[PDB]
Amino acid sequence: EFMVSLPRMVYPQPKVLTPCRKDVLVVTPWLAPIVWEGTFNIDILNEQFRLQNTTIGLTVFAIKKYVAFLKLFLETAEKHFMVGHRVHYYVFTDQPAAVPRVTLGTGRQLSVLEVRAMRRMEMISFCERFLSEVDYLVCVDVDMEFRDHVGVEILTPLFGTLHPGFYGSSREAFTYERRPQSQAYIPKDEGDFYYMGAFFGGSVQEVQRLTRACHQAMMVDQANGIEAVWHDESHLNKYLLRHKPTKVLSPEYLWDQQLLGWPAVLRKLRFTAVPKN
Amino acid sequence: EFMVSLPRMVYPQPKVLTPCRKDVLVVTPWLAPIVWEGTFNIDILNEQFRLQNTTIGLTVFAIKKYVAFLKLFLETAEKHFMVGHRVHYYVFTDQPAAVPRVTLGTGRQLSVLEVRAMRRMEMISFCERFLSEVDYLVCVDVDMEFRDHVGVEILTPLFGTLHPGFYGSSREAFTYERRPQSQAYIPKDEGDFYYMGAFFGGSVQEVQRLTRACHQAMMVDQANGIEAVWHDESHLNKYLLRHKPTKVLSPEYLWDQQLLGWPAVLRKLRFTAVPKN
Numbered sequence A, B: 001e002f003m004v005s006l007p008r009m010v011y012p013q014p015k016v017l018t019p020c021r022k023d024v025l026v027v028t029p030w031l032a033p034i035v036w037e038g039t040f041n042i043d044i045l046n047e048q049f050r051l052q053n054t055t056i057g058l059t060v061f062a063i064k065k066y067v068a069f070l071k072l073f074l075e076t077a078e079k080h081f082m083v084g085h086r087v088h089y090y091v092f093t094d095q096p097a098a099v100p101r102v103t104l105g106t107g108r109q110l111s112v113l114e115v116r117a118m119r120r121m122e123m124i125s126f127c128e129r130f131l132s133e134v135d136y137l138v139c140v141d142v143d144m145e146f147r148d149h150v151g152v153e154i155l156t157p158l159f160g161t162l163h164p165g166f167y168g169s170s171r172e173a174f175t176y177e178r179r180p181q182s183q184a185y186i187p188k189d190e191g192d193f194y195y196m197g198a199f200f201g202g203s204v205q206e207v208q209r210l211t212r213a214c215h216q217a218m219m220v221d222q223a224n225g226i227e228a229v230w231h232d233e234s235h236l237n238k239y240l241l242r243h244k245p246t247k248v249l250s251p252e253y254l255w256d257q258q259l260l261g262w263p264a265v266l267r268k269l270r271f272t273a274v275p276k277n
């Protein structure tokens, strides 16, 4: 925990009367940063997190046909995800033999965890070691590739990611679960953001809290014969409404260029959808 | 530590493509919020901190003639400082009998701590109970009055406050200690901000770390026959350069209207200088 001093660093002075970005909201109303290109000096952040010998776990599920996405996912993670930091990939699959042999950089390891042919929330919270092995957990979809830097700027006790389809939408248009019979229910007059289920994370403790809560809520819904409109994403949205994230990632971090192009407000496309279905 | 769910709340939706403030920097390059009016929803923050039964300690020194400032300081603190939260004032003085009898709101207490006729840094770190009694410490000058809200928006593990004289200045003009013989030395090409010694704080653990480090550095300087240009403020600046604060308060939180007026960029003057000397 004790944090040693940063070394001398030479970098541009932040200027108080000059915003980093004037086109987007860069802090939430509960004083959580919203992470966009131009808001962070990665050299400062890399120093801070390296001085703590930070280890990041990345969970990814590749079940049935989705094992086909692992090669590009992992090879591009090696180019772009937390480079220079300690990384432990946890690949959950029903086909351990189908996991591609991917060459890893130093300080990085991969574990194949076999699961049977609620699953993600249940598996992350009560199956999965994480408390002993990593400091932060990052939980992502596999049908994706990294194209640009995804680094320690995302790390914080709890984060969600703005869904690329809805970041400009008003809350009444968000596809929250709207049936009061569901544990994921959010009224039309509530909601901060629509977070996508495909990229969330935080400290191990906070991710375990989130995934446990979502799993429990999904079990209640199952017992009551209701399934939320967007499954675990609906529950994730309910949890993050009631437990505010300490950072929010911009849609740079979860994008679909085929569907949504490359808007001016995105200076980088960092982690992007690969064609499926 | 475990955080219960927030209740349902009705408030304006934050809009991603609408900044709260376009005239000022609202996040540092290490992703610490810079606290300005318009950046926070105090209802959300009050809920979050009340659900933790947060207790805030406020330290203030009133030695020799400065005991005269206590009445206005404390009476205005009662109107504006952390109202609704648990507050423990710690008044350090050489004249306990000169401390005014100030009426306090419920959930608020005051302790008079006698000291002899480095003192603040040494006293806060190794004399002073804080770990047992409060969650956060806020350390301020006494030659001041509260005019507007100062609340839980400031609370974070470690914060400093932008000096009202220098928030628009370039770093070469900052009055950092510039002699390499001083522990407080900062070269002309380093520095983020010029923080004022008159308002800093954080968790008890981080404030004890800061004050211990500054006290130790000041003792080294004394042993070497050098006194930093701005005394404890010079050391505070060195510490916060090397240990980045997790929030930075805007000059709303430390202002002198006689000297600097009321610029457009300040929507509120919250904690202001009273004439002295």
Ligand SMILES: O=c1ccn([C@@H]2O[C@H](COP(=O)(O)OP(=O)(O)C[C@H]3O[C@H](CO)[C@H](O)[C@H](O)[C@H]3O)[C@@H](O)[C@H]2O)c(=O)[nH]1
Pocket: A060, A061, A062, A063, A064, A065, A066, A140, A141, A142, A143, A196, A197, A198, A230, A231, A232, A233, A234
């Ligand atoms: O056969 C499979 C199916 C899924 N998966 C795993 O589940 C992840 C989500 O599914 P998908 O990407 O299709 O949904 P998207 O539309 O990108 C993601 C969204 O829709 C989901 C249902 O299809 C949920 O509602 C989720 O909460 C929401 O974010 C996928 O990346 C794999 O890691 C797998 O391993 N094998």
Ligand SMILES: O=c1ccn([C@@H]2O[C@H](COP(=O)(O)OP(=O)(O)C[C@H]3O[C@H](CO)[C@H](O)[C@H](O)[C@H]3O)[C@@H](O)[C@H]2O)c(=O)[nH]1
Pocket: B060, B061, B062, B063, B064, B065, B066, B140, B141, B142, B143, B196, B197, B198, B230, B231, B232, B233, B234
């Ligand atoms: O006789 C005294 C003298 C001081 N104090 C106490 O010290 C605080 C700082 O002093 P002051 O406000 O004069 O300095 P300012 O210019 O506002 C504050 C600045 O200058 C200081 C030296 O005068 C230091 O350099 C400090 O670090 C810097 O911020 C004052 O508010 C009292 O709580 C006291 O109790 N009795």
Ligand SMILES: [Mn+2]
Pocket: A141, A142, A143, A198
């Ligand atoms: Mn997907």
Ligand SMILES: [Mn+2]
Pocket: B141, B142, B143, B198
């Ligand atoms: Mn003062």
